[PDB]
Design a binder for this molecule. Structure first.
Ligand SMILES: Cc1ccc(Cl)cc1N1CCN(C(=O)[C@]23C[C@H]4C[C@H](C[C@H](C4)C2)C3)CC1
Lengths: 12, 225
């Protein structure tokens, strides 16, 4: 269930 | 006085903190939307959700934060979300709105289905913080210090977090000597509000289990709802 926060952290 | 590297760190933090603010559509929704528990609740859900986005953007730019273990990154975000939300909400409530919008936002908060158990410590905390008369630098640093708290649960490398937090504390400490030499315990007073802040973890957990209005998927993820 990381999906949203992980996306927000990793995105450029 | 601030050494030039402390000045470079402050300037870098402030650029990240000023970079994202409150969108006009939400602010106007405070003034113009229907007043009812469900509608008041929805506005607040929408402010909290925008705050999460802003919080992640600010957190990712903190010096050293991207060098931490990926699981630690997530634990810090999750652990600090509520506290950071309350700190930003205090800033907005005291400093970033016209006198009209503060009164109306207070009303909306008081009639959004939230228990009195939670409302009273909230407004007490906002008045407490408001009496410190913090500058924007002080809000930015305290937000950064709260996010880089090494004592969150399930942090593997606590020493690594301490190293990132400490320079921010040292800068905040120098700003309390400079902007209020009158009050030599001002720094400790600020850190006293972190203690008040931590109580909102319990209050917020309580308000959450005491539901079921829908939250957003981002809120559910970061609050573990
Ligand atoms: C007034 C402000 C401005 C900015 C931000 Cl980021 C948050 C706030 N709030 C202060 C705290 N607060 C809450 O605890 C919630 C938590 C949760 C979702 C939503 C509606 C209910 C239940 C109260 C927001 C009001 C919204």
């Amino acid at each position: 269930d990381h999906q949203l926060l992980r996306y927000l952290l990793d995105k450029d | 006085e601030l050494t030039p590297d402390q000045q470079t760190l402050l300037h870098f933090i402030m650029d990240s903190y000023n970079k994202q603010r409150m969108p006009q559509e939400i602010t106007n929704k405070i003034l113009k939307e229907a007043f009812s528990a469900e509608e008041n609740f929805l506005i607040l859900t929408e402010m909290a959700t925008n705050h999460v986005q802003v919080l992640v953007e600010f957190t990712k730019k903190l010096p050293g934060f991207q060098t931490l273990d990926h699981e630690d990154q997530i634990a810090l975000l999750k652990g600090s979300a509520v506290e950071a939300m309350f700190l930003r909400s205090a800033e907005i409530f005291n400093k970033k709105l016209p006198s009209g919008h503060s009164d109306l936002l207070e009303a909306r908060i008081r009639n959004s289905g939230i228990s009195d158990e939670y409302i009273t410590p909230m407004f007490s905390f906002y008045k407490s913080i408001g009496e410190l008369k913090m500058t924007q630098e002080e809000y930015a640093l305290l937000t950064a210090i709260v996010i880089l708290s090494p004592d969150r649960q399930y942090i593997k490398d606590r020493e690594a977090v301490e190293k990132l937090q400490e320079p921010l504390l040292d800068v905040l400490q120098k700003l309390c000597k400079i902007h209020q030499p009158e009050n030599p315990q001002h720094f400790a007073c600020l850190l006293g509000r972190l203690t008040e802040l931590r109580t909102f973890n319990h209050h917020h957990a309580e308000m959450l289990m005491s539901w079921r209005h829908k939250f957003t998927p981002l809120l559910c993820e970061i609050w573990d709802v």
